[PDB]
Amino acid sequence: HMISLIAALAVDRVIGMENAMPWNLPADLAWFKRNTLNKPVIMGRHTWESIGRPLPGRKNIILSSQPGTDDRVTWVKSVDEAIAACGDVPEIMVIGGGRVYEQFLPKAQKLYLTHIDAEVEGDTHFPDYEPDDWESVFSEFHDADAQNSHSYCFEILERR
Ligand SMILES: NC(=O)c1ccc[n+]([C@@H]2O[C@H](COP(=O)([O-])OP(=O)(O)OC[C@H]3O[C@@H](n4cnc5c(N)ncnc54)[C@H](OP(=O)(O)O)[C@@H]3O)[C@@H](O)[C@H]2O)c1
Ligand SMILES: Nc1nc(=O)c2nc(CNc3ccc(C(=O)N[C@@H](CCC(=O)O)C(=O)O)cc3)cnc2[nH]1
């Protein structure tokens, strides 16, 4: 009934390098937690492998073209199967990675983005979300501090 993408972006909207995350910002991941819990989460098979354990309290739906390899989650073969597998919920969280984010952006009505002031070379990037289609409805800047080496910004965008 409603799809959101939730993603932490560095410069160039880098989200993934060597299939990891080199921007140790704990308030950046504590932001993922306030926004994803009790909502179903959709992710691609690579993002599933990097969490290594379902997100608790939540239907975990993992897109892959091949049979599943973990009974603790729900395996689906298409974007529409992934959505249906989430049930009748007010909001579905799409949590990556690159390929899954791109497929779900046209279906999304909300984006929850952390922008981190960090240079990381990056093979994988968040999809280009046109400003004409998205409106910033929340935005809070934070300088680097004791826990965060990087300056960062939590943002919430709603589809126009
Ligand atoms: N910073 C962030 O916000 C964020 C979010 C998550 C992860 N990441 C990074 O993003 C990268 C991962 O993204 P990725 O693109 O590498 O892999 P992914 O998007 O996590 O999932 C890729 C895999 O999902 C499956 N898949 C996706 N769409 C499908 C579809 N429509 N039908 C069937 N199967 C489908 C395929 O698995 P098969 O090959 O089995 O078909 C595909 O190989 C990593 O670098 C990760 O660290 C960052
Ligand atoms: N805002 C935001 N920040 C992120 O770091 C992020 N990461 C992903 C995909 N990658 C990951 C990697 C690790 C964990 C993770 O370990 N989180 C656990 C514990 C809570 C925490 O560590 O913050 C979880 O319960 O989801 C989640 C997503 C998707 N959306 C995001 N969104």
> Where in the chain are the domains?
1-160
Tell me the two tokens of residue 121: 């070379």
Would you call 33 helix, strand, or coil by DSSP? helix
Q: Are 96 and 120 in contact (CB under 8 A)?
A: no
Q: 28 alpha carbon to ligand 2 midpoint, in Å?
A: 8
Q: What is the resolution of this structure in A?
A: 2.2
**Residue 99 DSSP label:** H
What ligand 2 atom has the least distance to the C-alpha of 28?
A: 3
Burial group, residue 54, by CB count within 10 angstroms (0-12, 13-18, 19+): middle
Q: Which amino acid is present at 144?
A: A
Residues near 137 by beta carbon (within 8 Å), at least 6 away in sequence: 156, 157, 158
Closest ligand to C-alpha of residue 25 is: 2
- The method of structure determination was X-ray
- The rounded Cα 47 to chain-centroid distance in angstroms is 9
Q: Which amino acid is present at 17?
A: M
100 is annotated as contributing to ligand binding: yes
Q: 46 alpha carbon to ligand 1 midpoint, in Å?
A: 5
Q: Where does 1-160 sit in CATH, by number? A: 3.40.430.10
Q: 3 alpha carbon to ligand 2 midpoint, in Å?
A: 17
